[PDB]
Amino acid sequence: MTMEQFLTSLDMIRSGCAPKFKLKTEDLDRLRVGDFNFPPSQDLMCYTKCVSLMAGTVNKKGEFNAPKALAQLPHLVPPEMMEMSRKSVEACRDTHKQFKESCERVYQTAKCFSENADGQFMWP
């Protein structure tokens, strides 16, 4: 995967999920560069679940699938994002266990990925 294919994918994914929710463009812009340090709306949290289902790394209850993600990494991120992605998955695999609502679970997991990124991190 090229960093180029990765970016196009990020944009395609956001276009499919955005429509379902009422979101602020500046919020999406912040998530895109891995800045999860701001209070998310419920809709924004549900946006992250939508994005994750689309990517296929969570189930409908918002539970993160670490093994699937770890297996699928090569088809998820460019090669230079692999290692960092793998470690973040390793550090955030149980985060969702502390939350009950599906949207929040995913959002919290994604936040965790962002805080554990040893380098550039991006979100659709």
Swiss-Prot record:
Q: Where does butan-1-ol bind?
A: S52, T57
Tell me a Gene Ontology molecular-function term this record carries.
diphenyl phthalate binding
Protein localization: Secreted
Q: Which gene encodes it?
A: lush
For this chain, the annotated S-S bridges are C17-C50, C46-C103, C92-C112
Can you tell me which residues bind 1-propanol? S52, T57
Recorded protein name is: General odorant-binding protein lush
Whole protein: which stretch is covered?
30 to 153 of 153
- Work out whether the entry's keyword set contains Cell membrane: no
Role summary: Odorant-binding protein required for olfactory behavior and for activity of pheromone-sensitive neurons. Binds to alcohols and mediates avoidance behavior to high concentrations of alcohols, the alcohol-binding possibly resulting in activation of receptors on T2B neurons, the activation of these receptors inhibiting these neurons. Acts in concert with Snmp and lush to capture cVA molecules on the surface of Or67d expressing olfactory dendrites and facilitate their transfer to the odorant-receptor Orco complex. Required for cVA response, probably by binding to VA.
